[PDB]
Structures are given as structure tokens and as C-alpha cells.
């Protein structure tokens, strides 16, 4: 639910859009996330590992 549960009720959202909003929040348009979504997710795993 992203940040929606912190401010009140938990509102479900697909994780890729949650990432899209967080990208928009730092000055990077959401199409950047969507165009590179697969790259970003695989890349995320190496960072967690």
C-alpha cells in the first residue's frame, strides 16, 4: 500500500506503480520506470543480496 497506510487507511496499489510514484517524486518521470521495469527489478535483487 505504499505510504497510504501510514497516513490512514491502507490503499492497495500495484508495486510497479508505487515505484512509479516514488520516481516521479524525485523528478524522474514514470515512463522511465515503466520502460526499464525488468532491468530495475533484476538489478534490485543483486542489491538486496
Amino acid at each position: 500500500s505504499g505510504w497510504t497506510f501510514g497516513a490512514g487507511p491502507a490503499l492497495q496499489i500495484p508495486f510497479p506503480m508505487q515505484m512509479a510514484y516514488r520516481f516521479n517524486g524525485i523528478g524522474v518521470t514514470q515512463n522511465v520506470l515503466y520502460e526499464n521495469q525488468k532491468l530495475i527489478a533484476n538489478q534490485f535483487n543483486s542489491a538486496i543480496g
Binding site: 510497479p16 515512463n31 515503466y34 520502460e35 521495469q37
Partner: peptide
């Protein structure tokens, strides 16, 4: 884009002109 839906987008110019 993943899961992009095949949906129409309205244009405010063609109905006007």
C-alpha cells in the same frame, strides 16, 4: 510498457476542428 491497456485517448481538437 507492461499491462498497457488498448484504450482510446480523446483529443480536444478534432471535435472542435
Amino acid at each position: 510498457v507492461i499491462g498497457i491497456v488498448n484504450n482510446t485517448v480523446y483529443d480536444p481538437l478534432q471535435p472542435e476542428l
